[PDB]
Amino acid sequence: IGWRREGIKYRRNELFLDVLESVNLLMSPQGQVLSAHVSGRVVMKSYLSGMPECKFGMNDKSIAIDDCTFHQCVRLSRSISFIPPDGEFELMRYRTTKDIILPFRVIPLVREVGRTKLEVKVVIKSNFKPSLLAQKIEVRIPTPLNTSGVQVICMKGKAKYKASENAIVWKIKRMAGMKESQISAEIELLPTNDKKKWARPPISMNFEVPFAPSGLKVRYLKVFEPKLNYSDHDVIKWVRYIGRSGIYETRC
Amino acid sequence: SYRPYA
């Protein structure tokens, strides 16, 4: 075993699991999902006495994994089984497409006003238990190149027009499950080349949520060391989930 | 932010 030495000792035997997932979406203006997927990895941080035999179990047949590689130390077939390296390492990588929780729904509305103004209202809805908070929320709304100026009103958060980047950027520190928020913007237009139709790019979002969008959920982590005089019940165990946007585009 | 699992 060339990834872990033999005489390791700790007064306090503790591990930490991180389930880290990126969730990706492309949605039509109607509300059809054109494309969606999750990339995820499990990271372990282990301060454990000896050379222990850990067994890792999740709800894996309960949601549906499309494929996944593992670390050297994993012995194949099922629940997963290994003697971990000490400290921090990558236990597995994985992908999932069926049955994804999409944390946010984006509902755009756009109206033209002669050749002089655009009217835009965007509504975000959060879709998860109310006991949980999303944080670090950005909503990016693109503006035409003939844009002369922009007014916004928003009851929650803060929004500036960023002329360099040709976009309105709306930021929110935190927001809870099953809620609704809206922004309005009036976009003042310069006159333009007449047969230039605007190709309306997507509205895109960023966020972080404390659950796995894939549905995945940790069911046991069991530690057994036969030589030494601590059992499973002696180990102090912790889990966290961090689900973050990848590409999350909603077409207007 | 780390939930007891023990």
Q: How was this one solved?
A: X-ray
**Residues A135 and A208 sit within 8 Å (Cβ to Cβ):** yes
Concatenate the DSSP letters of all residues of chain A into one string. Answer: -TTS-S----SS-EEEEEEEEEEEEEE-SSS-EEEEEEEEEEEEEEE-SSS-EEEEEE--------B--B-TTEEP---EEE-PPSEEEEEEEEEE-TT---SEEEEEEEEEETTTEEEEEEEEEE-S-TT-EEEEEEEEEE--TTEEEEEEE-SSSEEEEETTTTEEEEEEEEEESS-EEEEEEEEEEPP--SS-----PPEEEEEEESS-TT---EEEEEEE-SSSS--GGGSEEEEEEEEEEEEEEE--
Please report the residues numbered 65 through 104 in chain A whose beta carbons come closer than 8 angstroms to any beta carbon of chain B.
none
Check: CB of residue A123 under 8 Å from CB of residue A177. no
In angstroms, what is the resolution?
Answer: 2.8
Q: Check CB contact of A16 with chain B, cutoff 8 Å.
A: yes
Domains plus CATH for chain A? Answer: 14-100+211-250 (2.60.40.1170), 104-207 (2.60.40.1170)
Among A235, A236, A239, select the one facing B3 at the smallest CB separation. Answer: A239
How many C-alpha atoms does A201 have within 13 Å on its Cβ side? 11
Nearest C-alpha of chain B: how many angstroms from A222? 10
Beta carbons of A239 and B6 less than 8 Å apart: no
Give the residue among A49, A89, A124, A101 at the shortest CA–CA distance from A209. A101
Q: Looking at the complex, does the CB of residue A144 fall below 8 Å from at least one CB of chain B?
A: no
